[PDB]
Amino acid sequence: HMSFNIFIASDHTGLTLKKIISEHLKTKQFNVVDLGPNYFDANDDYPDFAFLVADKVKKNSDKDLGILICGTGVGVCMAANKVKGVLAALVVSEKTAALARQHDNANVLCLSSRFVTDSENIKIVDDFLKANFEGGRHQRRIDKIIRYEKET
Numbered sequence: 001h002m003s004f005n006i007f008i009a010s011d012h013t014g015l016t017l018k019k020i021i022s023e024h025l026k027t028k029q030f031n032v033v034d035l036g037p038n039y040f041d042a043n044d045d046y047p048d049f050a051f052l053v054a055d056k057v058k059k060n061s062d063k064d065l066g067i068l069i070c071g072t073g074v075g076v077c078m079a080a081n082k083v084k085g086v087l088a089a090l091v092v093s094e095k096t097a098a099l100a101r102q103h104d105n106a107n108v109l110c111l112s113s114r115f116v117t118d119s120e121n122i123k124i125v126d127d128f129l130k131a132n133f134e135g136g137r138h139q140r141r142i143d144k145i146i147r148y149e150k151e152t
């Protein structure tokens with residue numbers, strides 16, 4: 001949809017997947033912002049790119065989304081969740097992709113480049129974007145996370 005931006009980044013492990021996802025979503029008429037890296041550096045550091053995406057999502061945490069890729073998804077998930085207003089979900093199977101939105105209201109999707117195929121990652125992205133937050137008891141739970149980070 002034209003009303004929000006999707007920010008995408010990776011470390012050096014995820015450049016091919018990042019382009020596949022970015023171009024896939026652009027064809028579907030999403031607003032997609034590739035924050036890098038734009039060339040391969042075997043030694044680059046996933047937190048730098050996680051914070052680029054997460055700091056953008058933080059500015060529009062109710063509308064914008066992030067996609068972050070690293071070897072397992074773990075590092076970018078840890079880093080992105082440090083950012084105020086960010087709820088980052090690590091998904092490695094289509095079987096949990098919708099739930100990350102439905103229950104956890106995630107605004108950042110974290111993916112594995114080394115342990116999940118390109119095809120499965122595209123399916124994860126598609127189901128995450130198609131799903132909707134279910135609210136209710138899940139809103140009460142997310143509210144507790146937001147309150148902790150704001151008050152601690």
Ligand SMILES: O=C(CO)[C@H](O)[C@H](O)COP(=O)(O)O
Nearest residue numbers: 011013070071072073074075
């Ligand atoms: O998976 C990751 C973080 O969770 C990183 O992509 C991974 O640690 C990078 O490994 P290397 O420096 O050997 O390429």
